[PDB]
Symmetry: C3
Subunit: 208 residues, 3 copies
């Protein structure tokens, strides 16, 4: 097992290896219950091409065991053609030669900052998860998620948002995830409360 205990995961920056996975600071993944390194979480991601959708993960994300990001767009299957069979890809059968390539990209999968993904959640290709969002365990994400939204279910739904629209707006304005570590340690006492307005002030103050 890549992990020594269920209670201690390892940084993304120290286990990612596919060049198409760009991870941010402090972000981590604890997958003892699935034994494999974060790399294998990005399914169907080619480390060999640069013409493909990439998995981008913000900073301070906490990724739960077994999470999975389905990549490679449609994988060559086209529901809108008469046949969803990847003829073009079965290069070993001649009959299927003239077969055209039905593959088509879906765009980078983006995971914002401070996103908490529950064990075994699965993201479809091309979705974009907003900052602070919380992805429920086993939630199957079929689309974009709003910042600070709480989703869950198959298909994933917004259960509610973490803070007030206004609070959210403030949180987005000060983007503490881009703050110099020194300021993070400074505002620390306030990061451990739900007093966004307090935190906002402390911010505005120091900015001076």
């Amino acid at each position: 097992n890549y992990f020594e205990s269920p209670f201690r995961g390892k940084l993304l920056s120290e286990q990612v290896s596919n060049p198409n996975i760009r991870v941010g600071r402090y972000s981590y993944y604890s997958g003892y219950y699935h034994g494999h390194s974060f790399d294998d979480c990005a399914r169907y991601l080619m480390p060999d091409r640069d013409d493909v959708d990439k998995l981008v993960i913000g900073s301070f994300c906490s990724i739960g065991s077994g999470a999975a990001f389905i990549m490679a767009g449609n994988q060559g299957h086209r529901a809108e053609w008469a046949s969803t069979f990847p003829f073009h890809f079965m290069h070993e059968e001649p009959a299927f030669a003239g077969a055209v390539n039905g593959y088509q990209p879906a765009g980078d999968t983006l995971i914002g900052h401070e996103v908490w993904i529950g064990t075994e959640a699965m993201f479809m290709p091309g979705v974009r998860v907003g900052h602070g969002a919380i992805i429920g365990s086993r939630a199957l994400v079929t689309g974009d998620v709003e910042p600070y939204a709480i989703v869950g279910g198959n298909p994933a739904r917004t259960i509610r948002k973490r803070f007030s629209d206004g609070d959210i707006q403030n949180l987005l304005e000060m983007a503490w995830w881009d703050w110099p570590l020194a300021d993070i340690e400074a505002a620390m006492p306030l990061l451990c409360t739900g007093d966004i307005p307090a935190l906002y002030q402390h911010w505005k103050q120091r900015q001076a």
Copy 2:
């Protein structure tokens, strides 16, 4: 790992081994992310009896990693009896001797032709998936699916059908999945479009 890469699966005809799994041509399974051969996808399927429900898979199916077909009907559990405990099966405890066998078959699980199953989809016992249907990833199929229907969710729902009722009817009439490989290669250019009516004509023509 039974598979060498996430981007290349192997034919069903070349890995199936349980006598109760009947697979069609070109149908395949790509399960690098789950390491095991297709055989273990048919859960609780006995290769030793012939008095059991069988997993039948049509031709040109594309089965995603981790797919799973729950077999053995009710497995001896009966929700309608005073106790769902398989007394009859705990043959090691005498008290549970007179226990009657609550096992009961549910019927062959049938997967039509050209069915695209998403990674980690799970089918309950006895369901029948129609031709061309698309099974969303992680979708839990609790019942029959219509030809060309797109299902997904836990429990799985029809999101929509791939083509028009009429188009569908045409597609079912020419069953290109039973066409001689030679004709398949012939109509190939048209199989890579969504012009069912065009394809229908090309068919009717050649039939002459």
Copy 3:
């Protein structure tokens, strides 16, 4: 593989090892399709502390392969604070020193008697499943379940109850799961039917 066959599981009492998992008699788990012993089914459960929520499982339960019980309450993450990042736990970065511990227990997870859990069902922290309940496969349980209720889905829903409200009430009154094995073998013929009223009488009789 801890198991020799998909058709024969092993008692809980003979494989559990974490001191915080209290299992009842005859209860068992058949997880050949997931290879690991029941112990690893209780995720994030510390065998080293006694100040933590425990997984309690009643008697005569039939636990399906891959079932999973998410423990450790919130795991230190607090959706209601400005940041769901477990600062207090990243003890290797000084900036995050004053970080307060956001961990908070959710209470023992309780699985009543005669509960039939489907392969791959997942229970959230703190839920309490009532006696006789049936948990559908892949069902994600986000809350309490009623005795004799049938749930399923992500999130799990009650599909219906196994017996009549009255029948249920009778079943709860005679709690056959606490009956001396001798009486269990006696009423055996009636335990293999859906005649709760018959069973009730047979009970009342013998009680005399």
